[PDB]
Amino acid sequence: GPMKFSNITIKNFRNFEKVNINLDNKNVIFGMNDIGKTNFLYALRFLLDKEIRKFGFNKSDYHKHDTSKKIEIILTLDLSNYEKDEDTKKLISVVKGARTSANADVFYIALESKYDDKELYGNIILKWGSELDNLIDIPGRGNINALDNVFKVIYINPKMLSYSIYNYLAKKKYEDKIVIYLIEEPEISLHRSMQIALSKQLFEQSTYKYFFLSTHSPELLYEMDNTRLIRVHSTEKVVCSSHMYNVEEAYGSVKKKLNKALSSALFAERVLLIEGPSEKILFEKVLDEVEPEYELNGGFLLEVGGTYFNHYVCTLNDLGITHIIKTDNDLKSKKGKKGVYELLGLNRCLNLLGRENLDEITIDIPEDIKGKKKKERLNERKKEIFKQYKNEVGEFLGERIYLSEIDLENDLYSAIGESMKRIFENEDPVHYLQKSKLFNMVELVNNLSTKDCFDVFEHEKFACLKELVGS
Amino acid sequence: GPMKFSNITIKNFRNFEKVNINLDNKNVIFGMNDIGKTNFLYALRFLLDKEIRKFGFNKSDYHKHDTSKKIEIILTLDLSNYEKDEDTKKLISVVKGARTSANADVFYIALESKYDDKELYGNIILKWGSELDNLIDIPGRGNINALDNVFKVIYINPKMLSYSIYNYLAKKKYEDKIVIYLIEEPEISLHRSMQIALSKQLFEQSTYKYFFLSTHSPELLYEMDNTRLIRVHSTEKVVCSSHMYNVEEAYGSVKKKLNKALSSALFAERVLLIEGPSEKILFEKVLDEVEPEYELNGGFLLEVGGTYFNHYVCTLNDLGITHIIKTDNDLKSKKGKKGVYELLGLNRCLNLLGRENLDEITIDIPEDIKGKKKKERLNERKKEIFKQYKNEVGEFLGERIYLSEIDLENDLYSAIGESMKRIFENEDPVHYLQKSKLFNMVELVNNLSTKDCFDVFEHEKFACLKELVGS
């Protein structure tokens, strides 16, 4: 693989006590603690940009203003594909020596700084090379370091004209050096469509490579592909989590909706996954009637539709975001019917915990049986298979995965029984609600009372909302 | 009704040639031409804030730098409920005279300015009162005008602490004057959840009243209620459209999802309305395979689910946003079944054009007929009712409203027939796709080819995508 960033071990910086967060060329930093993201970007500027090193470090630049500690930010680089990667050649041409033949792939770039009290100016002492144990003397011919011929920081901070012309300027002038775009909040004066355009140029075109993107709007993350997403936790003590966000060719067709839905959820402290928009309407009504500040204390309703949760689960778990999923046990037929049914409702929850896909179970449904009787038989079979796999359901509850008894609507009817009958005035309100999920769900929500909302919220079969709200 | 702003007739300003856009206390300005929104906010500052009047007008402050023309911005106020509206008392206590007894409700506040060439300083000559024809001499005791005791502009431009403490400061200090918050892009350094919080305090709490909000992120418009949404058109010649955005008590329950979906669509030049997420997946795949820049040249996929389009149609039409709707003719039963069916697929399209709701039509479906035969009978009835109302369908095509022959999936099968059979390998792929819309639609999209996408795009039954793409 081409040359890629690997890790940065920021220690005793303005806010970073001791963090070793992985990197990979295309980087995205977001989340809480805007000062944390700003400090991370300025740490990269200190490690790579000469325009920031010359000012040195101050008393405030250290962690808790404690001048005793030493700033040590160590960028880690991975080198491979020497004969075809131009940037690898750019990095290894300037470095003369200090590269042990044992490990020609790894390359450290550290930055040691100790504060002196006789002058109140912490000197930036670059010490880069290939091994942490042994460092040779850096040339440092005056103000320009040897690193200055390799890594030049192009700082973008607000105007689409500048973004459009930086491509031309770098292509025609900065070919020799490696460009590292440290973009900090480019959504300041860009429209939603402008944010989409900038995301398309960033995450798809090769003109922006090795870029560190700071964003606060989900629109800038609509085209994420093989990047490294970095999320800063909400605590004042900065904790950052990293995840390779790459879409498989299986999800390539649905990549647009996948990214559009996941980008908004990336900024939520707690994310709840749902299948259909009727579930969205019901959960939104319940939350508005019990806790309208769910979006405020950290919450989201991620509508995934079909596909699988595997990509969503990996992305949400790697960033450390609270993981909540409520799903419906659905038995879908495939190829020849009448005895062929998959277990997507359960096959998903198995795939989230790994294991293996269940075989296509066979249900003996007579041909003459149809309509209400067929649905009753399917519900009985779903109840039987749910009662059979009690251990798997227990593991899902232990791993914050919620699976319905048969379907979501049956759980809703169990939580509130008389309210459904009063609203729909039918002997079988569940069947009527399944007849047209959207319109009937809207009608149910419009006539849904606060007491009914509280009953739904406090029921154990709807514990997803309780987990989303939190303490 | 309480005192409310009514209109501002900005003439010959920095970019506004001649515009008379309505106002109402809670105002939102967004869209293209960020300079246009900035000029509008500075026009309000000139008309109300003394901190901007003292600098006067410059050569650049006029339209096309033509000093011959005269700046004339005329704010229009509506006065009512005198005995209970404190702000009405605040406005009418300072004004002594100049209020004709014939019209005590309307109140103009103009601002005339002519450029002199002997000093190169356009004097701001305030002329306010109650009638355009006759104006009495304004007191103007020095630097502070008589208006300065009524309207004080609180300019907010980046930090949630300032927003939190402006409430306290205005409540404890600015009780006597009328506060007019001219908020310009508060999303500069606010998170998505912070934007939601600010929107909640703005559009719900009474502490922010008479505020002019400029936004570029849809997250700030998640709580819109009885405000006046102002959209600037994309042309360099500024055109602004206004609309009262108020939710009826019928839509109050679904208000959260309504606003969440509509806020994003508000920033799109062209908006296409869809019902289900499977439609979203299909349209996204087709667009990505024919025109990935649909989000760039102006486009959106508004998922409305159930409810009605009436609120959406009114909002999108009033702002002047291109209106595109693709819908499915669905016959939903109500109360006692077997002969009772509504025409939501057609009742909607009728309600969008006004008229009256069709009566609940009766379909003679025998009880023994079920499953495939019942669906076939329903499709035949839908085809018959579509062929019956050719004139209504022609009007919908004339008004950019697209109604399916029977359903969307049937139109998709008509557009591409062999591709569906190849992908699903079933004698009736449409029935299988309706069996589980989400998963089967995902499977179809994953195996959908570029030639099939082009065929779907160029077919007349999918003209919604062609209209969304445009020339």
Residue numbers in the entry:
A (entry chain D), B (entry chain C): -1 to 156, 263 to 575
Show me the paper's own sentences about this structure.
The Gabija system is a newly discovered bacterial immune system that consists of GajA and GajB. GajA is an OLD nucleases family protein, while GajB belongs to the SF1 helicases. The Gabija complex has sequence-specific DNA nuclease activity and prefers circular rather than linear DNA as substrate, its activity is more sensitive to concentrations change of nucleotides compared to GajA alone. Our data suggest a mechanism of Gabija immunity: the nuclease activity of Gabija complex is inhibited under physiological conditions, while it is activated by depletion of NTP and dNTP upon the replication and transcription of invading phages and cleave the circular DNA to prevent phage DNA replication.
Here we report the cryo-EM structure of the Gabija complex from Bacillus cereus VD045 at 3.6 Å, which provides the direct evidence of interactions between GajA and GajB. The resolved structure shows that the Gabija complex adopts an octameric ring structure with four GajA and four GajB. The whole Gabija complex resembles an octameric ring with three 2-fold symmetry axes. The three dimensions of the octameric ring are 171 Å × 143 Å × 91 Å; The inner diameter of the ring is 35 Å at the narrowest region. SEC-MALS results show that individual GajA and GajB exist in the form of tetramer and monomer respectively, supporting the hypothesis that the octameric ring of Gabija complex is formed though two steps: the tetramer formation of GajA and subsequent octamer formation of Gabija complex. The interactions within GajA1-GajB1 are mediated by the ATPase domain of GajA and the 1A, 1B domains of GajB. Despite being present in the cryo-EM protein sample, domain 2A and 2B could not be traced in the electron density map, demonstrating that this region is quite flexible in the Gabija complex. Size exclusion chromatography demonstrates that the NTR region of GajB indeed binds to GajA, while the CTR region of GajB doesn’t bind to GajA. There is a highly conserved region (E379, E383, D432, D434, D511, D513, K541) in the Toprim domain. Non-specific DNA cleavage activity is only detected in the GajAmut1. These data suggest that the lysine-rich basic patch 1 of loop (residue 436-442) is responsible for the selection of sequence specific DNA digestion of GajA.
